[PDB]
Amino acid sequence: FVMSAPDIRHLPSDTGIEVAFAGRSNAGKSSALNTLTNQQLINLFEVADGKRLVDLPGYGEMKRKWQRALGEYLEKRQSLQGLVVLMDIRHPLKDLDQQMIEWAVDSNIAVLVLLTKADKLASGARKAQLNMVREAVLAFNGDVQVETFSSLKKQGVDKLRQKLDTWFS
Template sequence: MTSAPDIRHLPNDGGVEIAFAGRSNAGKSSALNTLTKHKNLARTSKTPGRTQLINLFELEPGKRLVDLPGYGYAQVPLEMKLKWQKSLAEYLQRRESLKGLVILMDIRHPLKETDMNMLEWSSHRELPVMLLLTKADKLSPGPRNTQVIKVRQAVANLGPQIQVEAFSSLNQIGLEKLAQTLTGWYLAGEAAEGTIDAEQDAD
């Protein structure tokens, strides 16, 4: 649909949006491409930090996927990094159509400080979160399952709205669970919008 530097350049704040966020080397673009079965939907790069704008993709009318600027790792000037962080924070705090957040972390290096900040903010807003531990193909099944359990235990105190799953764009580990979760969020968001519209009509 569009690429915007901040929320003031986004379309009207209606419908249902599900956003993807993560550190700049977490494999966010690859996950979006795997999910949508579009090889070049979100541009991938060997240089982390290429997503510098808020990118909106419309699945069907009123249902959008949002690719947020990566946070953390990117080798960019501090001024630019602060600008990204501001636009990211504005979107997360003010966008009413945001109904779910997918946070991606490398399964080998999860729960960095910036990741925890995102999870705590999401908990404060009571926003459903799917925490994807990406690059799961890098670990054999035993260590992979152990890491998933450890992360689930680490975030348990933030509330029941956080779901933790292993994910691999390469081997499509966790893809079905991701698709099912997002479908549920879109349906719940639509139902909530319908309730609000009905209440406004009654008034």
Template sequence: MIHFQKAKFTTSAPDITKLPADSGIEVAFAGRSNAGKSSALNTLTRQKSLARTSKTPGRTQLINVFDLDETRRLIDLPGYGYAKVPEAMKRKWQAALSEYLQERECLKGLIVLMDIRHPLKDLDQDLVFWAVDSNLPVVILLTKADKLKPGQRKKTVLEVRQASKNFGGNVEVMAFSSHNGIGLPELEKKLTTWYCPQDNEATDTPEA
């Protein structure tokens, strides 16, 4: 059982050399700077300001670490793709993101957040391909799902699921809303399978 509400901020790091020891299990959240990443983290942890939301997207310039317990962590990766951020800063973030995804051994899954009204932008797709190439399971979390009517929401989810087959690898698609909790139970269930792999193995063991 993972108690997401117990999440607490540990540190902010400019790159992986300043992160905690590469052990235990980490799950990372990444997305465009206006995709609602901070709101999603706050909703997941039932905390209003664990991840700071900003009226100016692109302010999250560091890798933020939140401990769930002694061996499990949530990682808030720098937002990307916001036009008003200087080019040099974008390159710095991209390098940190690349290094983290490719070299962090304790990273067991990646949540890629996309606004359900504007999914699968080029940078989003690049990130998912990147994760698949690194053999990471991915959840595409379509945020702000409350902005669409139920029929349109379902249609968009199905369209993104169909498109996600092009990525190969282990990629799932979920709708999510920080405003009314759409998709929160499904997200918690998926994260728990990543954080508690031994439970999955016990469940998957066939009967004699």
């Protein structure tokens, strides 16, 4: 099924396994999830009996509240087994992006960073950004895998499916 919940207290029973997706607006979150399924609020899609994908509201005096809710989810959700943080390869690692990774790492949650719109950069610049984010990510001291992603060219889709299969198994 497909569900939408107003807050964490309304999420379905905290049992089984789920993987969350997060990122600023226009990071390709929806487009990325569409490569996994064909099916503000927190949207959930159950891909199996007790296996769900969670789409956390984009974080793109008023934001303090919403940013706090994101951290509470990462810290309290017992069934959370991984976090996918999507960021545009042209402007990755913004303060909020780094905050989500740090929070995940402190809650012992594995992380997968997807540098989206990878097709927007030439081979040379694309590789340069990937290497930069990989080096930068070592500063978190966690389990942070980084991969380039392109919804248009369907690049990085298999890597995403493989990461998920590992976390779901």
